[PDB]
Design an enzyme around this catalytic site. Structure first.
Site, PDB file in Angstrom:
ATOM      1  N   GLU C 183       1.993  -2.918   8.782  1.00 48.92           N
ATOM      2  CA  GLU C 183       1.922  -2.384   7.416  1.00 48.92           C
ATOM      3  C   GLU C 183       1.763  -0.874   7.381  1.00 48.92           C
ATOM      4  OE1 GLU C 183      -0.034  -2.722   2.933  1.00 48.92           O
ATOM      5  OE2 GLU C 183      -0.683  -4.255   4.403  1.00 48.92           O
ATOM      6  N   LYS C 225       6.011  -4.579   6.893  1.00 48.15           N
ATOM      7  CA  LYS C 225       5.505  -4.657   5.526  1.00 48.15           C
ATOM      8  C   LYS C 225       5.469  -3.264   4.920  1.00 48.15           C
ATOM      9  CE  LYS C 225       1.697  -6.129   2.586  1.00 48.15           C
ATOM     10  NZ  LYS C 225       0.828  -7.306   2.202  1.00 48.15           N
ATOM     11  N   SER C 296       5.476  -9.822   0.258  1.00 47.84           N
ATOM     12  CA  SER C 296       4.121 -10.078   0.765  1.00 47.84           C
ATOM     13  C   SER C 296       3.197  -9.425  -0.262  1.00 47.84           C
ATOM     14  CB  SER C 296       3.888  -9.526   2.139  1.00 47.84           C
ATOM     15  OG  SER C 296       2.498  -9.280   2.340  1.00 47.84           O
ATOM     16  N   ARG C 299      -1.598  -8.295  -5.405  1.00 50.51           N
ATOM     17  CA  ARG C 299      -1.830  -8.080  -6.828  1.00 50.51           C
ATOM     18  C   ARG C 299      -0.706  -8.620  -7.690  1.00 50.51           C
ATOM     19  NH1 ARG C 299      -2.935  -1.711  -6.589  1.00 50.51           N
ATOM     20  NH2 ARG C 299      -1.390  -2.074  -4.908  1.00 50.51           N
TER      21      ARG C 299
END
Lengths: 351, 356, 351, 356
Positions: C183, C225, C296, C299
């Site tokens: 990420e 990501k 992915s 929120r």
């Protein structure tokens, strides 16, 4: 191994001669287009004989210069010219106790993708060129890279590329018995203050020496030719010769391994006299400094001689005496023993 | 955006200079608990908190002839919180004798996937809060050890770069929290390589380290380096004089360590107590210019005789202490170039892949 | 060799499951302090049972989610919690056809010398942690680095360090049979426009993959990501979903080798609905895209469910149906077949 | 501060796509003068400007069945300024047959001090003004060759980095002046290494190249790459099937070459004409996803039979041309996955340390 023990000793020897105590370098290696601007500034036509006479003027100055000047950097054309008395210019130089140097870069080129930054070209065929230059009497060499402090410069791509071409250039030079003077110039252009030049100077030397390590360069057989660390030219704020001296000696202490034989500063637009005063502040700094800290000056040895020559052969020995005063002032300044109009003129030119 | 204010930089530099002030050196008593056990097993002693408390005490309380000899003392975490029989905390025992208190902060080597047995070191997690604490508790310098090996295809580019990076992260966190970092990129003596091999590799490693410390904005004047000397490999057939080891070692540093570094405090390696002192002395006698303090950060090579003399027996306390002192005095004259010279101090202290 | 052929196939298998066609990831791995802010936003106290009930709420949604969700990233505490019916949460997740994932970073830490930049910590002991997590049912992992576009950020030091910790983290993960989700988040904070995010996104992925090469990472057994490529949050100028889609697909085409198994985007503060619309613009781009391009989302799958729960156990099946609409919308969006208040709220929070 | 405007980028991308449009490939007729001599000596022919003019003409004017086969043709500088017997300039012969005109711009390998016989390439000096000219004169792509070797301690970190940098400088100058760069980081087949060794090293090299092209802000969609296939070394004892070479090669590219790269045009290496075509065909038949054109940039492997048939003798012109065509047709079906198959085309074309 890049080099044998015998080759290594030849380069350490040469390098220690150049920056022997109280000696510096005359940077007399302006391109034809660059010496044009200096000649035009005094009304003189840019012809081969005028360039030959001006360079003869400087190299044949009286023997008081002989302990001040360890080497003389020349431009291609000049290395193959002769004095009035028939002697080729390199013998003129050696005969007075100095090492002949030759400038081998082929100027700067733009780096795409960046805010006006350059790299430097000239490695094509450089190994043969150096072999021939060494045969014709040159024993060290010069290569100039140019970086500039702006809001997004010196770029990472810029620092890395110029550090890499420096090291190539120097690998070739040492393969051929020639000591490389490594010139990473940070220009004084802009309004940045002193700390910023110091941050940028440290950053660039760190990259230079890493790149030299990576390429297997024998550091005892190199010289470093860096800018002094100074506010930008358009800085409003003002700084003393001691602040400049501290800042330069700090930046070099933090980045340049003691194995480097000598540091020969460029003047960078400083007046003849400021260049000398600063060089002296630097050698009087109490901090420990394991290398020669001396001068490799073009403009700051030649401005008074140029304007005293005026292009007139009658002014030869007034012009030659102006060079020899600046040569003597700097030889004292690189030992801390210099304590003293055309010598006070700013010599700054954009780029 | 500067990492450090002008006062933060003065505190760090003063600390670094006290530790290597002329004549002084470092005692490395910073053995892991599983590492020091391998020492006490060798003199038939059980590895109890109290036998560790006692042996450390013996070194820290040796008579006051060592004070001009010992600028700093590196402690394992456990020991920093132990007390003499006096009830005085060991930090205070050390300070009162004139030394700066140090603390080992790494958490050991871990393997690098895809390499021939090479390692990084770990220990950055929560390091900043650990340092603040260690600093409240009396420590003014830290130590972190990285281990590299000479071999077929090692140290690789990956291991040289990863190990230098993590030494740079460690150094930046130490200085934020007030603590002088000792950067230790140890190249092991294992193998049969010659002296020039070890010099080549040492120069390559130390150039990578000092590029990394520059990229991470480390204040060099508040740093120390603990490297290996340039020595032939442990199994090397050929023989090299002490003056050749001095030449190769001083040359390797002069090609890589910026003059701003306050000091270089060598690890002893596999060397015997007597060889460690003689090579350090030959190094300080090298006439080449050496702009940094050249001194010792010796663990095994200050303690081999003391530990054999102590033998586990409370009755020998003063006899062990005396052997330690005699070595601290030897290394203090060596770290000035003025050491002119038993079986314990001639014994090789080499262990394959040193770990602690 | 970092890995054998049998280990390599286990990781390629796992990675292809997660991003199998029409499937994405539920990023349910908020720290205790991070889920506090989301709970507080709905009046609910931050207690272990409330966090357990909310996570139970999401994992036990009805079987229409089972083809939409290939994996579920959990936080430590949650991996060791059980549903009401006694089943541990990882079995709940597998029982519906998804892979259990665990977040293993220990948050961000400041990098000295820089303008507010961070690296990420958590490698200390990570190899043992992963061995145990794999034993307890996790098969992939997550590590988050954070960079920010400002006038002197992302720094060179910053990009290089975060790229290096990513690769370490991933080397360890694969040694233990765990697929690493890498990420590198560029935050949307600031007033920069779309091209600038694209320049910075390309620059950061180039460094990430170089660093992955250097550390010997098996790329077929990783996921990437990244942020979508979007104007900054305070950009006045406006851009279409197609401009965003082009710019994201261009940046990834220019930097991410085809060997990477799947790209699972973070939502980054985008509204539930914009995240879905953009994800669909991206998968409808005609340009060639050799990897899964899917979601992915934390929120942007959970905001409507959170506000529909309100902390009240009676609202469970209204909240659960809100999740399942966003889960179904995104499963259609990662195939280009999604064409359609609390789902329109900007979810942007500074840092 | 962008390197290129949106139109500059469209011109560069259109050019790159014409050259590798489906079915098409590249003819590399770009041999140095001292290199092509070693070819004509092999068919007993003197190395005169006129014998070079004639042999090139034979390849460029082969019948129009090659036009759907040949997307570009790389010329040495000398040849770009030569004319057919027609009086037509060779650039125009090539354009009229449907191909893009290319030009070799490097100036040969030079040695890297301190390495085991490794090299960089030189040729950047004045490159920008050379390119502007070549572009006025009909050239729309360029080629620059870097050479790496698998060996004990080679390719070293220095050689991998220096060679990728200089390919990046070359690429940026070409694009400024309108010219699509072919980036050729050739890893030689010399040695007895296996296929996995060559795959490992190819992956390491191509990752360094594409990091360098990113650092130098190169527009990848206006680039091509000419790498080696992943093959066992020339002296390797073990045997590998064509499908294993396809697997290792496609895998190595899928791990390193960004999809934005418009095409990958392999060099033939030491491979025979028939082996070059079969491996290229097996590569295009690999069912793994391959987001770039996979085609040929073949020098020796398009010309071995033509040159042996021509023999130096004007009478064989049409017989040489036919052998070239048959190979261009073979490689056009290979570069689509549809090649189902003499002594000249089964002969190894390997030469230790290939240079031109």
């Amino acid at each position: 191994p890049a080099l044998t023990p015998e080759q290594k000793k030849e380069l350490s020897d040469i390098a220690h001669r150049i920056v022997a105590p109280g000696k510096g370098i005359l940077a007399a290696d302006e391109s034809t287009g660059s010496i044009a601007k200096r000649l035009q500034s005094i009304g003189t036509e840019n012809t081969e004989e005028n360039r030959r006479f001006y360079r003869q003027l400087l190299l044949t100055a009286d023997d008081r210069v002989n302990p001040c000047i360890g080497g003389v950097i020349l431009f291609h054309e000049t290395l193959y010219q002769k004095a009035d008395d028939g002697r080729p210019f390199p013998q003129v130089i050696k005969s007075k106790g100095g090492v002949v140097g030759i400038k081998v870069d082929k100027g700067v080129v733009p780096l795409a993708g960046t805010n006006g930054e350059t790299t430097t070209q000239g490695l094509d065929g450089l190994s043969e060129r150096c072999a021939q230059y060494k045969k014709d009497g040159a024993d060290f060499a010069k290569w100039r890279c140019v970086l500039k402090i702006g809001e997004h410069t010196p770029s990472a791509l810029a620092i890395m590329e110029n550090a890499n071409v420096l090291a190539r250039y120097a690998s070739i030079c040492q393969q051929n018995g020639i000591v490389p003077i490594v010139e990473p110039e940070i220009l004084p252009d802009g309004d940045h203050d002193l700390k910023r030049c110091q941050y940028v100077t440290e950053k660039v030397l760190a990259a230079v020496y890493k790149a030299l390590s990576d390429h297997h360069i024998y550091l005892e057989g190199t010289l470093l030719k860096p800018n002094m660390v100074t506010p930008g030219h358009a800085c409003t704020q003002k700084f003393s010769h001691e602040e400049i001296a501290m800042a330069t000696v700090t930046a070099l202490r933090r980045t340049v391994p003691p194995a480097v034989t000598g540091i020969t500063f460029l003047s960078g637009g400083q007046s003849e006299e400021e260049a000398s005063i600063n060089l002296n502040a630097i050698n009087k700094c109490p901090l420990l400094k394991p290398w020669a800290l001396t001068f490799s000056y073009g403009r700051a040895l030649q401005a008074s001689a140029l304007k005293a020559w005026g292009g007139k052969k009658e002014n030869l020995k007034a012009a030659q005496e102006e060079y020899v005063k600046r040569a003597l002032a700097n030889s004292l300044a690189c030992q801390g023993k210099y304590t003293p109009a055309a010598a006070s003129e700013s010599l700054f030119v954009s780029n």
